[PDB]
């Protein structure tokens, strides 16, 4: 099944994909997603990465203390008090990021599907 | 509309949306891009970045929040 995976996943043809994890398989190719900022909606099966954790020299967006989302690439990650947190490298300098402070662009994620797309 | 930028915004549902904004868009103008996408009453929307205020008839530029391209500031609806 694919009930309770994490996943990264986008709601918009055009849109960024962001954590959470499937919920329930639903009708119509869709999949209730609940993602870890709390948002829960349905979901084309085409819009999700079953990619956990995300690998090693993805490039992501992350954001960054200042407030501003901006491309980054994964380089490490670490599971601390049953939260997941990545090491991304901006500008050649690591720093750590909560789950939910990464994401992937259209075109990010878009590189990742052939190899972890649902389906 | 050529020279737009993306920027997020945190709902206070926990969802993020993007949107396309101009250097010359007030933050009215962004509120009621916010009310077009994602149907939240302007007179609802209390918009910060970074934990300060965005006041009525400023642009992001008048708080210097827009950057490059590669930089994509995240608004918090409060």
């Given at each position: 099944?694919?009930?309770?995976?994490?996943?990264?996943?986008?709601?918009?043809?055009?849109?960024?994909?962001?954590?959470?994890?499937?919920?329930?398989?639903?009708?119509?190719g869709?999949?209730?997603?609940?993602?870890?900022?709390?948002?829960?909606?349905?979901?084309?099966?085409?819009?999700?990465?079953?990619?956990?954790?995300?690998p090693?020299?993805?490039?992501?967006?992350?954001?960054?203390?200042?407030?501003?989302?901006?491309?980054?690439?994964?380089?490490?990650?670490?599971?601390?008090?049953?939260?997941?947190?990545?090491?991304?490298?901006k500008?050649?300098?690591?720093?750590?990021?909560?789950?939910?402070?990464?994401?992937?662009?259209?075109?990010?994620?878009?590189?990742?599907?052939?190899?972890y797309?649902?389906? | 509309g050529?020279?737009?930028?993306?920027?997020?915004?945190?709902?206070?549902?926990?969802?993020?949306?993007?949107?396309?904004?101009?250097?010359?868009?007030?933050?009215?103008?962004?509120?009621?891009?916010?009310?077009?996408?994602?149907?939240?009453?302007?007179?609802?929307?209390?918009?910060?970045?970074?934990?300060?205020?965005?006041?009525?008839?400023?642009?992001?530029?008048?708080?210097?929040?827009?950057?490059?391209?590669?930089?994509?500031?995240?608004?918090?609806?409060?």
């Amino acid at each position: 099944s694919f009930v309770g995976l994490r996943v990264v996943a986008k709601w918009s043809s055009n849109g960024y994909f962001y954590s959470g994890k499937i919920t329930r398989d639903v009708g119509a190719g869709k999949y209730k997603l609940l993602f870890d900022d709390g948002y829960e909606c349905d979901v084309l099966g085409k819009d999700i990465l079953l990619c956990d954790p995300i690998p090693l020299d993805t490039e992501v967006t992350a954001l960054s203390e200042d407030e501003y989302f901006s491309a980054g690439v994964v380089k490490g990650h670490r599971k601390e008090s049953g939260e997941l947190y990545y090491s991304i490298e901006k500008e050649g300098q690591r720093k750590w990021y909560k789950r939910m402070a990464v994401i992937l662009s259209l075109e990010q994620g878009n590189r990742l599907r052939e190899q972890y797309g649902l389906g | 509309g050529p020279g737009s930028m993306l920027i997020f915004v945190k709902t206070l549902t926990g969802k993020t949306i993007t949107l396309e904004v101009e250097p010359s868009d007030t933050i009215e103008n962004v509120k009621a891009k916010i009310q077009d996408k994602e149907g939240i009453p302007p007179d609802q929307q209390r918009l910060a970045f970074a934990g300060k205020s965005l006041e009525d008839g400023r642009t992001l530029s008048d708080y210097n929040i827009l950057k490059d391209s590669k930089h994509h500031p995240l608004l918090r609806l409060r």
